[PDB]
Structure formats: C-alpha cells, structure tokens
Scaffold this active site. Structure first.
Site, PDB file in Angstrom:
ATOM      1  N   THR B   1      -1.979   0.179   3.589  1.00  0.00           N
ATOM      2  CA  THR B   1      -1.829  -1.382   4.444  1.00  0.00           C
ATOM      3  C   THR B   1      -0.951  -1.553   5.486  1.00  0.00           C
ATOM      4  O   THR B   1      -0.035  -1.344   5.575  1.00  0.00           O
ATOM      5  CB  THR B   1      -1.094  -1.866   2.905  1.00  0.00           C
ATOM      6  OG1 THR B   1      -0.541  -1.475   1.452  1.00  0.00           O
ATOM      7  CG2 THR B   1      -1.824  -3.825   2.689  1.00  0.00           C
ATOM      8  N   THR B  19      -6.045  -2.275   3.634  1.00  0.00           N
ATOM      9  CA  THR B  19      -5.536  -1.193   3.019  1.00  0.00           C
ATOM     10  C   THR B  19      -6.624  -0.057   2.916  1.00  0.00           C
ATOM     11  O   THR B  19      -7.810  -0.244   1.941  1.00  0.00           O
ATOM     12  CB  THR B  19      -4.582  -1.324   1.679  1.00  0.00           C
ATOM     13  OG1 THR B  19      -3.910   0.133   1.554  1.00  0.00           O
ATOM     14  CG2 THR B  19      -5.387  -1.577   0.665  1.00  0.00           C
ATOM     15  N   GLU B  21      -4.473   1.454  -0.361  1.00  0.00           N
ATOM     16  CA  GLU B  21      -3.659   1.826  -0.601  1.00  0.00           C
ATOM     17  C   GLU B  21      -2.173   3.240  -0.472  1.00  0.00           C
ATOM     18  O   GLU B  21      -1.798   2.654   0.235  1.00  0.00           O
ATOM     19  CB  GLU B  21      -3.953   2.112  -2.108  1.00  0.00           C
ATOM     20  CG  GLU B  21      -3.229   1.796  -3.348  1.00  0.00           C
ATOM     21  CD  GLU B  21      -2.028   2.059  -3.535  1.00  0.00           C
ATOM     22  OE1 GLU B  21      -1.739   2.521  -5.220  1.00  0.00           O
ATOM     23  OE2 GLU B  21      -0.870   1.818  -2.833  1.00  0.00           O
ATOM     24  N   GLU B  40      -7.060   2.933  -4.981  1.00  0.00           N
ATOM     25  CA  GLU B  40      -7.191   1.895  -5.145  1.00  0.00           C
ATOM     26  C   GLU B  40      -6.700   1.433  -6.493  1.00  0.00           C
ATOM     27  O   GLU B  40      -6.388   0.528  -6.694  1.00  0.00           O
ATOM     28  CB  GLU B  40      -7.709   0.620  -4.418  1.00  0.00           C
ATOM     29  CG  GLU B  40      -7.263  -0.714  -3.880  1.00  0.00           C
ATOM     30  CD  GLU B  40      -6.824  -0.558  -2.903  1.00  0.00           C
ATOM     31  OE1 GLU B  40      -7.404   0.232  -1.344  1.00  0.00           O
ATOM     32  OE2 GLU B  40      -5.253  -0.297  -2.783  1.00  0.00           O
ATOM     33  N   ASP B  43      -3.748   0.538  -8.947  1.00  0.00           N
ATOM     34  CA  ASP B  43      -3.298  -0.707  -8.754  1.00  0.00           C
ATOM     35  C   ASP B  43      -3.830  -1.299 -10.194  1.00  0.00           C
ATOM     36  O   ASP B  43      -2.986  -2.820 -10.606  1.00  0.00           O
ATOM     37  CB  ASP B  43      -3.809  -1.577  -7.999  1.00  0.00           C
ATOM     38  CG  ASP B  43      -3.363  -1.257  -6.400  1.00  0.00           C
ATOM     39  OD1 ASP B  43      -3.096  -0.274  -6.136  1.00  0.00           O
ATOM     40  OD2 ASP B  43      -3.941  -2.632  -5.782  1.00  0.00           O
ATOM     41  N   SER B  62      -4.781  -6.999  -6.583  1.00  0.00           N
ATOM     42  CA  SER B  62      -3.516  -6.639  -5.328  1.00  0.00           C
ATOM     43  C   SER B  62      -2.516  -7.838  -4.885  1.00  0.00           C
ATOM     44  O   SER B  62      -1.799  -8.508  -5.974  1.00  0.00           O
ATOM     45  CB  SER B  62      -4.617  -7.092  -4.352  1.00  0.00           C
ATOM     46  OG  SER B  62      -3.508  -6.966  -2.993  1.00  0.00           O
ATOM     47  N   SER B  63      -1.643  -7.388  -3.897  1.00  0.00           N
ATOM     48  CA  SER B  63      -0.200  -7.681  -3.823  1.00  0.00           C
ATOM     49  C   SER B  63      -0.419  -8.995  -2.473  1.00  0.00           C
ATOM     50  O   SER B  63       0.393  -8.762  -2.381  1.00  0.00           O
ATOM     51  CB  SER B  63       0.365  -6.484  -3.416  1.00  0.00           C
ATOM     52  OG  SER B  63       1.282  -6.853  -5.348  1.00  0.00           O
ATOM     53  N   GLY B  83       3.090  -2.992   2.534  1.00  0.00           N
ATOM     54  CA  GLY B  83       3.983  -2.940   1.722  1.00  0.00           C
ATOM     55  C   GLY B  83       3.785  -3.041   0.682  1.00  0.00           C
ATOM     56  O   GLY B  83       5.577  -2.922  -0.997  1.00  0.00           O
ATOM     57  N   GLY B  84       3.235  -3.010  -0.990  1.00  0.00           N
ATOM     58  CA  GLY B  84       2.703  -2.596  -1.461  1.00  0.00           C
ATOM     59  C   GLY B  84       2.695  -3.991  -2.784  1.00  0.00           C
ATOM     60  O   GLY B  84       2.480  -5.358  -1.873  1.00  0.00           O
TER      61      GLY B  84
END
Ligand SMILES: [Mg+2]
Ligand SMILES: [Mg+2]
Lengths: 357, 182
Positions: B1, B19, B21, B40, B43, B62-63, B83-84
């Site tokens: 990311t 990203t 991932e 991805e 996720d 996603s975040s 940062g996930g």
C-alpha cells in the site's frame, strides 16, 4: 526533503524518485491528475512491492473548475470462479495467512491501469506516451534501491524465491542491498507495450492472457475472460463534518471512510487536547475508541453492491452517544462487541456477524 | 500500500492510496513481464457468511482512506496512508493532531501513533513514554515490549492566506515533498 513549499504545485509521494517526475509534469503545465498518473507508474517501478498495475487503488480528486469531488475506484474484483469457502482447507479450517497470501485464489483482477485511463480523459491534458516514458527509463536503465525496498526484498526472500521474481530480485541466492541497481527489463517491455497498443494489451492481450496462465499455475481461478470483463467504477465520497471542517473520505467497499469518521465522532466530545499528547489519557481514549470502531467494521463492512452497510446508522448522532457510553477514563471496556447501528437506519443485515482469526 | 498526493495551479486536488496488498503482493511475478501480482482477495473474510465474505465479482473490503479536508467549501488538507488495517487509525490520529491539537502538519504526522483493533492486537510507535505504557497496561491494555512504525502519511496543506501549498512526506519511508513555481 521531507518538508517543503511551492506556489503552483505540490507533489508528495512515498519515494524520492517518484516525486521528482510528477513535479516535472507540473512544471511543464501538466495538471495534478497527469502528474498523479505519472507517479503511479514511477512508484510501480521504484516501489514495486507497494503499488502496481497488478493491483487496486482509490483515487480521490477535487475538480478545477466544477468543484465536485470523486473517486476512481480501481479495486480488484474476484474472478467468477472464486468461492466463499476458497480459503478453507478440506477440513473446514482457515488456510494459514502465509499460504492464502501466495496462492492464486488471492489474486483479484488488477484494476490500476483501467483507473489511470478513467482519470485521464476525465481530467487528462497530456500524453498518453509522455507519463509512462520516464518510468520506462527507470525500468530499462535501472536505478539504485532505497532502504525500504532493500529491506522488503530481504524480509520477503522466501515468498519471492518461489516465483519468477527470484531471477531479478534475488540475483543469485542473496537479495539486492541498498544502493544496488535494480533493472527490470521485462517490466520495461510491458510498460512500452502499455503505451503503444493502449490498455488492452492488459485486458485483451498477451498480458491479460499471461496473467490468466500464472494465476492458474498457482492454483487460482482467473481466466482471460475475467480480465476482459473488468471495469473501474466512480464513487462519490462519504462526507463528514469535524471541528468545523468538511471531510471527504472513502465509502464502501472501503471500511476506511466510515470508521475514521466514526472514530473522530466518538472522540470529539472528549475534547482530547485538554490532555498532553503523550499522556495516559489520550492513549486510553484512543484505544477504547478504536476497539468500538474496529468491532463495527468486522461486523458490517463489505462491497455495497453485494451488502448493506448502515452508513447512516454507524454515524447517527444518537448511535454515537450510545457507544460513547462505553468509553470512560475510569476503566477499560472489556465487552468489545459490535454496536447495533441498525436501530438507527432503516433496514436489516443481509448477512451474519462471523468471527475471523 | 502506498499513498501520494498532488495539487496544481488550477485548483485540482489528488489524494491517491493504492496497493498490491502484502509487500510484493502474492509474490507472483507475471513471467517475462516483470509485473507483481496482488493478493488482494485475502482482504476477504476466511470463514464465510459475513458482510465481507468472498464472492465472485465482489471487491474485498479495504481500509484505504485517502481524504481531503475542506474549510468553507474549499479543500485545505489532504491525508492518506498505507499500513493495512491500521490505516484508518493513522489518518484519524493525523487529523486529530492537526485539527484538535493545532500541531504543525509535520508535527501531526510524526507524533507517535497507537493502533489496536481488539483486546489482542496492540501496536505503538516509538515515542510512547514508558511510564505511560506501563500505567496503560496496568489499566488493562496490552502494548507489547517493543515499538513499531505505523503507516506513512503524505499530505498537502493548502494555504490561502499565503497563497501556497505545503507538502509533507512521513519519515517512515524515504518519501519526499517538492513544490513547483513559474
Ligand atoms: Mg478542540
Ligand atoms: Mg512516524
């Protein structure tokens, strides 16, 4: 430099060689979107572990001019062969993250290139041979790798060893060190080809087909059909007001926008700046707040084309008040379940609340 | 990311998070193409049946949180990070530091963050005072015995009053900001 000021443009990116080229684009009258596109290719070459045309993204833009704000949502989609339980072993047990992570089933249809084309044409005023050419030079003639990249390659030797990557990131048995020159001849090949026949090298070419090959070679279910089908989508932002400002963030299928706003909404009433920034108080109220929001995310968040997220409910003034009950300075809440935001939005979940590890 | 941002002289504002991932994604590299391939779909939830279960043609949750903040219909600030799942928390905290503490933009970025999604996941950036971490864990938290960098904010502030853009790149990686004139 990590801090700096300018009159007519600003670019700030994760890599010094990616900043650089966007700035060049702005200096030659190219707009922000042109430059953003250029940067994404540059990052793909210079920061290859992080971002890529073999991935997805969310591009938020403020217009000109029209003064509207939108998102180019190039997030990957699952191929039609994917299944709800593809991440279980034959015993119904979740497959190790280390294992899921390298398997073909993990791969969503990459959308970044389609997103770049969407953005350019909407707000593009350059190219489309110019903004990938400088990336082609870096891939072809190489560049020295930074610490972050050096470390990534060291820290993920074993994942990279098992793939075609090892030839070029693991030259012999070791991984390139800071300062070594990274040449990606094959990536340059692909990038040149992207510029020439357009995108459809990728959604309808060698490239698309070649990906379909490898996803299957690694167990995955991706066909060239899937790639040909893929299309980005445009999203309007999720909005919030905070502290007298107006916030545009990502809506579903990201969890980011809702819960960051909810996090702010929860914490706002606590007038945090009363406490020192490195004080027990701040940390504790942050921690408690995160627990609540993250619980909501685990129960209610998913692609809205397939599910119902209570956006209204999750931010309802009365919901926030209910949940803020659970946040005190006089102890840590141990009862960290999801809230019931459904009590405040009209509807019912079309799904359950399933624990994950 | 990764997250980057751009602003031009004709008012446009770009906040872009993006990203593959995991670092290098699945690790897979399209053969003789050099192109790294995302994981991805991990996720998506493992045990099926929730909002974020795997489905054909669905996008995994996603975040990512590219954001633009507006004072009075006009964009004044841009925030985003990788940062996930900690992303949400990085942007949250950056915004707090900048708007609730009135810290400089860079100061808001650099100011140590926490992250914690459950009672069993805690992380903190170096800078958290020891006495403080200790007293938090007495209270019932689990900030572990050593710190980690969390995220990577890049951000531009839009300065009407001085007619400029101020761009900042988080120290967490070797990113950089530069402005253009003339
Ligand atoms: Mg205040
Ligand atoms: Mg930092």
């Amino acid at each position: 430099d990590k801090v700096a000021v300018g009159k007519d443009g600003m670019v700030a990116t994760a890599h010094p060689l990616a900043s650089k080229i966007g700035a060049e684009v702005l200096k030659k009258g190219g707009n922000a979107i042109d430059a953003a596109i250029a940067i994404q290719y540059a990052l793909n070459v210079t920061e290859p572990m992080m971002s890529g045309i073999g991935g997805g993204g969310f591009m938020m833009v403020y217009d000109g001019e029209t003064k509207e704000t939108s998102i180019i949502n190039s997030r990957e989609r699952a191929p039609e062969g994917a299944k709800p339980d593809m991440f279980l072993d034959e015993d119904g047990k979740v497959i190790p993250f280390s294992e899921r992570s390298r398997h073909g089933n993990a791969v969503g249809v990459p959308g970044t290139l389609k997103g770049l084309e969407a953005a350019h044409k909407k707000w593009g005023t350059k190219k489309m041979e110019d903004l990938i050419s400088p990336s082609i030079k870096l891939t072809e003639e190489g560049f020295p790798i930074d610490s972050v990249l050096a470390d990534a390659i060291k820290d993920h030797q074993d994942k990279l060893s098992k793939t075609a990557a090892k030839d070029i990131f693991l030259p012999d048995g070791e991984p390139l060190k800071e300062g070594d020159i990274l040449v990606q001849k094959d990536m340059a090949k692909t990038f040149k080809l992207i510029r020439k026949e357009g995108s459809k090298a990728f959604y309808d070419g060698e490239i698309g087909r070649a990906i379909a090959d490898v996803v299957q070679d690694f167990g995955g279910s991706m066909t060239p059909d899937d790639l040909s089908r893929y299309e980005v989508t445009t999203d309007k932002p999720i909005w919030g007001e905070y502290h007298g400002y107006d916030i545009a963030s990502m809506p579903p299928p990201s969890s980011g926008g809702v819960f960051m706003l909810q996090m702010l909404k929860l914490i706002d009433d606590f007038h945090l700046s009363q406490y020192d920034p490195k004080s027990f108080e701040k940390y504790h109220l942050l921690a408690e707040t995160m627990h609540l929001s993250y619980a909501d995310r685990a129960a209610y968040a998913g692609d809205p084309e397939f599910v119902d997220v209570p956006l209204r409910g999750l931010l309802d003034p009365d919901y926030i008040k209910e949940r803020q009950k659970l946040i005190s300075l006089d102890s840590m809440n141990r009862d960290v379940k999801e809230g019931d935001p459904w009590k405040y939005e009209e509807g019912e979940p079309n799904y359950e609340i399933v624990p994950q590890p | 990311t990764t997250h980057f941002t751009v602003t031009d002289q004709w008012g446009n504002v770009v906040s872009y998070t993006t990203t593959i991932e995991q670092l290098f994604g699945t690790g897979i590299l399209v053969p003789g193409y050099g192109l790294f391939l995302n994981n991805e779909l991990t996720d998506f939830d493992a045990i099926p049946g929730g909002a974020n279960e795997v489905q054909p043609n669905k996008r995994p949750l996603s975040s990512m949180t590219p954001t633009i903040v507006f004072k009075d219909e006009k964009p004044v600030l841009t925030v985003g990070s990788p940062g996930g799942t900690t992303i949400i928390a990085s942007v949250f905290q950056t915004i707090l530091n900048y708007f609730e503490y009135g810290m400089s933009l860079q100061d808001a970025i650099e100011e140590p963050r926490i992250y914690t999604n459950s009672l069993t996941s805690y992380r903190y950036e170096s800078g958290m005072p020891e006495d403080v971490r200790r007293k938090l864990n007495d209270f019932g938290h689990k900030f572990g015995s050593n710190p980690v960098d969390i995220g990577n904010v890049q951000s531009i502030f839009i300065d009407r009053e001085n007619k400029t853009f101020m761009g900042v790149a988080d120290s967490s990686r070797n990113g950089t900001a530069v402005g253009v004139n003339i």
